[PDB]
């Protein structure tokens, strides 16, 4: 079904996606505090998982911004970790036995609202960089390469976060509806490798998204 339990507080707001968001952020901060609760030079048991994770984070951050990795290493790690969180959350989430009011709640990225949220964060971070490091008057909006090169860039800058949200939302809702229709057609034995490949793509899409975001970030740096 393409419906959800709309809570109202001034507009109809699907409570299911936000509930999944609260759950994902909750598990995120829980594992983050269990890891960052006991600091160690020789890294602690399981803390080395978070350590190699943040190592890869700052590594790719150095790879795509370079020096100003640490200016946005937190934002990029926030993006990729929360995105892989919602990805594996929709992957592993037994989330249907408690039927909610108008729609079930498994992952919030299934709502493309979340994709629009993160991609607006991407475009706005690009604007903050292209106004802060680059000129506020002459950002990338300044038609540098040709005088005729104004509106192609004007279309492309919009197309960047738009397709960023589009691809991720489609990937999330795609894996969701795939497992849904597969359990609808046949019993539980069939969809297992389908969900396995969906989980393979799940972190992959988050990684590629953070990669392209930091590509645009090294671009606005450039």
């Amino acid at each position: 079904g393409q419906h959800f339990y709309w809570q109202i507080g001034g507009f109809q707001i699907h409570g299911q996606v936000l509930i999944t968001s609260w759950v994902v952020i909750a598990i995120l901060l829980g594992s983050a505090a269990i890891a960052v609760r006991s600091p160690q030079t020789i890294p602690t048991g399981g803390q080395n998982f978070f350590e190699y994770v943040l190592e890869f984070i700052r590594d790719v951050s150095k790879t795509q911004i370079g020096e100003e990795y640490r200016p946005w290493v937190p934002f990029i790690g926030t993006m990729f970790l929360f995105i892989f969180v919602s990805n594996w959350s929709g992957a592993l989430l037994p989330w249907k036995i408690i039927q909610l009011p108008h729609g079930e709640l498994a992952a919030p990225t299934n709502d493309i609202n979340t994709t629009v949220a993160l991609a607006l964060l991407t475009s706005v971070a690009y604007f903050y960089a292209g106004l802060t490091k680059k000129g506020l008057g002459y950002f990338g909006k300044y038609i540098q390469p040709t005088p005729i090169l104004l509106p192609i860039n004007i279309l492309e800058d919009f197309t960047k976060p738009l397709s960023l949200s589009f691809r991720l939302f489609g990937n999330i809702l795609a894996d969701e509806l795939v497992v849904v229709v597969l359990v609808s057609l046949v019993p539980l034995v069939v969809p297992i490798p389908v969900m396995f490949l969906g989980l393979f793509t799940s972190g992959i899409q988050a990684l590629i998204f953070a990669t392209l975001a930091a590509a645009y970030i090294g671009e606005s740096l450039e």
């Binding site: 707001i13 936000l18 505090a33 600091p39 943040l54 937190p74 926030t78 970790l81 609202n113 949220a117």
Partner: peptide, 27 residues
């Protein structure tokens, strides 16, 4: 469908981003 649930989740994501930044990736 593009409701105001997107701005609500945008608020949720921004608060969680700054919080978890200073919470874990700082510490």
């Amino acid at each position: 469908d593009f409701n105001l649930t997107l701005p609500i989740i945008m608020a949720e994501f921004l608060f969680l981003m700054f919080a978890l930044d200073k919470i874990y990736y700082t510490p």
